[PDB]
Amino acid sequence: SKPREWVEAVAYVGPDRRRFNSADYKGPRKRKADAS
Ligand SMILES: Nc1nc2c(ncn2[C@@H]2O[C@@H]3COP(=O)(O)O[C@H]4[C@@H](O)[C@H](n5cnc6c(=O)[nH]c(N)nc65)O[C@@H]4COP(=O)(O)O[C@H]3[C@H]2O)c(=O)[nH]1
Ligand SMILES: Nc1nc2c(ncn2[C@@H]2O[C@@H]3COP(=O)(O)O[C@H]4[C@@H](O)[C@H](n5cnc6c(=O)[nH]c(N)nc65)O[C@@H]4COP(=O)(O)O[C@H]3[C@H]2O)c(=O)[nH]1
């Protein structure tokens, strides 16, 4: 009805669309969390 998993951004408001993670990803990266 109302669980955790909540991200609040100015243009996006709602739960995180991320649930998959490929360390063998072949293509352009654009996620802030991909920074060391
Ligand atoms: N198709 C696709 N594009 C990807 C993916 N990962 C990153 N991107 C792209 O990278 C951009 C990073 O925007 P940001 O302002 O640095 O930072 C992001 C981020 O901080 C936040 N944000 C919005 N939606 C999400 C979300 O579902 N998850 C997370 N973790 N942050 C989000 O709002 C900012 C603006 O997001 P956008 O305008 O959507 O812009 C996103 C999006 O176009 C992915 O897996 N698939
Ligand atoms: N490290 C990294 N991996 C990336 C990036 N863009 C795509 N991927 C990978 O490619 C898959 C396909 O993304 P999609 O078809 O754009 O579809 C994405 C996208 O539409 C959405 N999404 C997630 N986070 C964001 C975000 O921050 N912004 C936007 N606009 N969409 C997001 O969630 C969907 C999840 O797709 P999946 O097939 O489960 O998993 C994602 C993810 O494993 C990226 O910038 N960095």
The closest residue, in CA terms, to atom 32 on ligand 2 is: 17
| Cα–Cα dist 6/25, whole Å | 25
CA dist., res. 10 & res. 12, Å (int): 6
- Residue 17's nearest CA partner among 29, 31, 34 is 31
- Elucidation technique: NMR
- Cα(32)–Cα(4) distance, rounded to whole angstroms? 21
Q: Whose CA is nearest to atom 3 of ligand 1?
A: 30
Q: How far apart, in whole angstroms, are the C-alpha atoms of residue 3 and residue 5?
A: 7
CA of 21 to the centre of ligand 2 (A): 9
